[PDB]
Structure 1
């Protein structure tokens, strides 16, 4: 299955999304129990445009592995794309509970809180993101400025 996964990735980087999905489905068929492969297939499917099927594969992955940071990250990204911030909020709170030391999680949590509207939550999370990491602070500065 590793080399089918590699063929799928090689097709994906060249833009042939349907071919990448074709490789990735076989890669699943070999090893049904997986998480990263499921996520890659859901990404290819949403690249094609099948958002509902990507969601179904994603929830299958999360049911199979309840503790999977990347899977939940992809759930949150897709829900943000789909304007489902109501449950995206719980996805991000669970994710930041999983990873407390990652500044990227704090950035997304604060951005979602600002989008939904909690000013205090947004400013607190963005200040925490500032404190943790100054490398990506340029975006964090703008995120504070727009919230303020």
Structure 2
């Protein structure tokens, strides 16, 4: 499962996301418990612009291991990219509960409120992002 996964990663790092999918699928046939392989499969679909597929595989990775602030953040991103701002907010909140110093999660939470026309809330979360990254 290791070589298949790293073979997938070598294609991923080049922007060859569909080749990466084939090899991540092979890694997961051998080790269906690999949160890493699920997560990176979801990343490959995200990069392919298939947010519904990314969400299914991120959900599976988060089922096996609900600890990465990064994984909740990327689940929020996938929902954001398909216009599901309620769900994006839910998952960005979960990300921030695990990593309050994520300027990225505060910023995207701002953006989700901005997209809903909630500019008062957007401004609150952009200000939090700027406390952590004042060079944003």
Question: TM-score when scaled to structure 2?
Answer: 0.84
Q: Report if the CA contact (8 A) 1:42-1:57 is conserved.
A: yes
2:126 is equivalent to residue 126 of structure 1: yes
- Residue-pair matches, total: 136
2:43 is equivalent to residue 43 of structure 1: yes
- CA deviations on 1:36-61 (whole Å, 9 max, x unpaired) are 32121122234456544333222222
Compute the displacement of 1:34 (Å): 2.4
Partner of 1:101: helix, strand, or coil? coil
Q: Relative CO higher for 1 or 2, CA cutoff 8 Å, sep ≥ 6?
A: 2
Q: Name the CA distance, whole Å, in 1 between partners of 2:52 and 2:111.
A: 25
In the alignment, structure 2 segments of 5+ residues that lack a partner are: none
In the alignment, structure 1 segments of 5+ residues that lack a partner are: 138-148
Matched residue, 2:55: 55
Q: Say which is worse superposed, 47-56 or 122-131, in terms of deviation.
A: 47-56
Compute the displacement of 1:23 (Å): 0.9
Q: Name the CA distance, whole Å, in 1 between partners of 2:69 and 2:21.
A: 22
Larger Rg: 1
Question: TM-score when scaled to structure 1?
Answer: 0.78
Root mean square deviation of aligned Cα: 2.1
Q: Report if the CA contact (8 A) 1:36-1:71 is conserved.
A: no
Compute the displacement of 1:102 (Å): 2.1
